[PDB]
Design a protein around this ligand. Structure first.
Ligand SMILES: NS(=O)(=O)c1ccc(NC(=S)N[C@@H]2CCN(c3cccc([N+](=O)[O-])n3)C2)cc1
Ligand SMILES: [Zn+2]
Length: 258
């Protein structure tokens, strides 16, 4: 009886195995655009993905993860609110059963169709497993997806999803360039939060881009054909794998832009 997104094991239940679910810096949150503070001392984000080395794609039973070689500074995030260098380890998405929901963060209570999380860890902690134990261990770059025009840089991901339909399936996924998933602007909101799935560790500096990317109806429909279950288990579509907005508590969301 492990956590998930169903009636009996979904976000309202998590606190029973993961009591930090009710903690002081949980994610996601609503981004109230009118009460976010412009911080004119925030640095431009530096996204350095030219040397990114993607390895594989995995259906872990909660989402699909595109994994990268994080054994050297190949794909890094710097600047913005961050001190030091964070390495890209993986990206994944959260999405809805319907275009009117699927994002974890909301903007003035608006839900997008999906949300992309590019997960990075602070190199001063040596590996991802150490980093998640530290209050400054991770930087997650969050990008909203709306349904409209296709995103061409997403299509390689959409086309491989047939090979990882079920929990535990993996496929080789080399030479994927995550720069093809970024919007034009790197204007952002930032706040201190958590992982949005168990174990809900309060180790994340969230960086949420103002500008969504547009994906096609056919691209998000292909996400909804995935399964939460393993092969040979009853079929349950992988949809609505999002945690709702949590209380902001004693936090201020800062903006890089006026
Ligand atoms: N949606 S999200 O972007 O907030 C986001 C959510 C979940 C993860 N977790 C990933 S990719 N791997 C898991 C999470 C933490 N983890 C554990 C668990 C307990 C202890 C340790 N350890 O060794 O210190 N490691 C391995 C990344 C990102
Ligand atoms: Zn996520």
């Amino acid at each position: 009886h492990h956590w998930g997104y169903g009636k009996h094991n979904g976000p309202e239940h998590w606190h029973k195995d993961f009591p930090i679910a009710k903690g002081e810096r949980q994610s996601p949150v609503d981004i109230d655009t009118h009460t976010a503070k412009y911080d004119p001392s925030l640095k431009p984000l530096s996204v350095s993905y030219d040397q990114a080395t993607s390895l594989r794609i995995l259906n872990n039973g909660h989402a699909f993860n595109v994994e990268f070689d994080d054994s050297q500074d190949k794909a890094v995030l710097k600047g913005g609110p961050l001190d030091g260098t964070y390495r890209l380890i993986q990206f994944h998405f959260h999405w809805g059963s319907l275009d009117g929901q699927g994002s974890e963060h909301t903007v003035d209570k608006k839900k997008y169709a999906a949300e992309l999380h590019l997960v990075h860890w602070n190199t001063k902690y040596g590996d991802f497993g150490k980093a998640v134990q530290q209050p400054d261990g991770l930087a997650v770059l969050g990008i909203f997806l709306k349904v409209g025009s296709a995103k061409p840089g997403l299509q390689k991901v959409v086309d491989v999803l047939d090979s990882i339909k079920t929990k535990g399936k993996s496929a080789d996924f080399t030479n994927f360039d995550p720069r093809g998933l970024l919007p034009e602007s790197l204007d952002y909101w930032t706040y201190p939060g958590s992982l949005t799935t168990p174990p809900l560790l309060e180790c994340v500096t969230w960086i949420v881009l103002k500008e969504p990317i547009s994906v096609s109806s056919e691209q998000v429909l292909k996400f909804r054909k995935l399964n939460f279950n393993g092969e040979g288990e009853p079929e349950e579509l992988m949809v609505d794998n999002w945690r709702p907005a949590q209380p902001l508590k004693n936090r201020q969301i800062k903006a890089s832009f006026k």
